[PDB]
Structure formats: structure tokens, C-alpha cells
């Protein structure tokens, strides 16, 4: 579902939408992914 | 994606992990869930 958000983000960049909000949405998406990866490593740490 | 981390967290509770142990993980999960819902509404905000 995250890649689906990236597809919608890129589609908005192709359609020439607001660069200020698409940039904040991109950096917000990069932050959420970098926090999901850390949350995966914590649950995985309980098994190794 | 994020759905697997929810199932991975719910399964830990099924494995005997008390809600106090996963409190840091369940609060980080919900913080990303609402982050995901906010990012989706921001997408509709541009198309709006």
C-alpha cells in the first residue's frame, strides 16, 4: 500500500500539482518508511 | 507493508507478550497508522 502511495505521489507530480506539498508528502513518506523499517527490526530482534 | 507489522504485533500479544511490553511498539505502530491516514487525506487535499 506504501508503493501505491508513491504511485499516487508520482502521478500528482506528473499532473503538475503543488510542489511544496508533494515535497512534504515525499519527505513524510520517506520518514514513515524509515520508521517502519526500524519497527520491523525491533519485532525481528525478539527472534534474532 | 504496515499491515504485516500489525499482524506481527498482534501475534506477539498472542505469544504471551503483555500490552505493557509492546507499549512502545504498539504506540509506534498507531503513530504510523494515523500518519498513513493523514498522508492519504493530504493526497485527496491536492485533488480537492
Query: At what resolution in Å was this solved?
Result: 2.3
Neighbours of A23 (CB within 10 A): 12
Distance from CA of B37 to the nearest CA of A (A): 11
Whether A1 and chain B come into contact, CB under 8 Å, resolves to yes
Query: Is there a contact between A8 and B36 if contact means CB atoms under 8 Å apart?
Result: no
CA B13/CA A45 separation, integer angstroms:
15
Identify which of A27, A48, A16, A10 has the alpha carbon closest to the alpha carbon of residue B35. A27
Select from B44, B34, B40 the least CA-distant residue to B6. Answer: B34
Assess contact for B47 and B17: CB atoms under 8 A: no
Query: CB distance A39–B45 less than 8 Å?
Result: no
CA torsion A48→B3→B6→B7, rounded to 10°? Answer: -70
Cβ A14 vs Cβ A22: under 8 Å: no
Longest CA–CA separation in chain A, Å = 46
Does A26 touch chain B if contact means CB atoms closer than 8 Å? no
Amino acid at each position: 500500500n506504501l508503493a501505491a502511495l508513491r504511485s499516487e505521489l508520482q502521478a500528482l507530480r506528473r499532473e503538475g500539482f503543488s510542489p511544496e506539498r508533494l515535497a512534504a508528502l515525499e519527505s513524510r513518506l520517506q520518514a514513515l518508511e524509515r520508521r517502519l523499517a526500524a519497527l520491523r527490526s525491533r519485532l525481528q530482534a525478539l527472534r534474532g
